Design an enzyme around this catalytic site. Sequence first.
Site, PDB file in Angstrom:
ATOM      1  N   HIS A   1      38.985 102.085  50.544  1.00  0.00           N
ATOM      2  CA  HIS A   1      39.063 101.278  52.080  1.00  0.00           C
ATOM      3  C   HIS A   1      38.918 102.483  52.936  1.00  0.00           C
ATOM      4  CE1 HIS A   1      40.804  97.814  49.622  1.00  0.00           C
ATOM      5  NE2 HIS A   1      40.371  97.287  50.724  1.00  0.00           N
TER       6      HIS A   1
ATOM      7  N   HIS B   1      33.264 102.111  53.883  1.00  0.00           N
ATOM      8  CA  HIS B   1      33.606 100.738  53.849  1.00  0.00           C
ATOM      9  C   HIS B   1      33.335  99.980  55.193  1.00  0.00           C
ATOM     10  CE1 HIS B   1      35.746  96.978  52.966  1.00  0.00           C
ATOM     11  NE2 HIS B   1      36.690  97.449  53.799  1.00  0.00           N
TER      12      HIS B   1
ATOM     13  N   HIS C   1      38.799  97.080  60.770  1.00  0.00           N
ATOM     14  CA  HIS C   1      39.507  96.012  59.923  1.00  0.00           C
ATOM     15  C   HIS C   1      40.387  96.704  58.948  1.00  0.00           C
ATOM     16  CE1 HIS C   1      36.361  96.321  56.938  1.00  0.00           C
ATOM     17  NE2 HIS C   1      37.110  95.602  55.919  1.00  0.00           N
TER      18      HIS C   1
HETATM   19 MG   LIG Z   1      41.960  94.949  54.247  1.00  0.00          MG
END
Ligand SMILES: [Mg+2]
Length: 326
Positions: free
Chosen positions: A80, A84, A118
Amino acid sequence: SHMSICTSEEWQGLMQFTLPVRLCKEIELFHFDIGPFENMWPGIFVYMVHRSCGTSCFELEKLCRFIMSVKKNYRRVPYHNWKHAVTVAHCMYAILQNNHTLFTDLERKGLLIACLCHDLDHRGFSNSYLQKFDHPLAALYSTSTMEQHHFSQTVSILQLEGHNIFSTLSSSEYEQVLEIIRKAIIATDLALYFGNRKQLEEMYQTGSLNLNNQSHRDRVIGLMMTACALCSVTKLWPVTKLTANDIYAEFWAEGDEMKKLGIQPIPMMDRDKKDEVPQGQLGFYNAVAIPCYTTLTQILPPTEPLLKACRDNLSQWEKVIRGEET
Ligand SMILES: [Mg+2]
């Protein structure tokens, strides 16, 4: 809010960045992998924003500061991370380009930004971990814990001097885009995906789905966010496979911490249970990925390539299970 801020050299460098001609054509495709072009990632995002929203949508200086500061607030975790974020934003770009007029200018600019942000400040730990061990974040955000945090981080970056790319919107449109972004980021909490997909599938099959209905639009956008957030499963097999390595590296580290707290982690997060991964992936594709892209394709026909690629990768995992891996 303890946010990291880019340097002048960083955002000015982006402002002068020029994207190679050859990539312009490649970036339009669903299967494009940004992997081999690390130095160009921020520039690729500027390019996508400009093509989808126009070169004058955002003040260039503010947009470059925003992008480089966002990069700086992603951590050096295995999955993450910044790579990404740009990968997810590119999938959204491809979806929007292929369904352009179905979405408003406000929605397209809000969704590209929501995708870049996000997973802001992700530390490599799941909502399951934060809630099981009573992390302060779980107290502040009772559900969709990390996602509420990612949105808070997004607003904190907009609040940095010279970083508010949305300030030129009317007060009404400003409020609206922040809500589009909040809902979009919260939708990336997979816990919410199951119910959203079930609902959308029924609205679609019964013919009640209506894009002029705000709640319906919100749900469709939520499914688009899930589709983009999981898009590693829609790349060519070698890319999907390499990305799975990063995903598990992050999971295994969380599992290691759980053992230190006296709790046996789920098999997926246990580095001593790697033999169970192929079946685990099969389960994920059958319960999450395939249904997601199937319903997305029904609602937005042009996104079919994502479903086809997902199906191809499911077949690859089945080959692994049959012992045919190379
Ligand atoms: Mg997430």
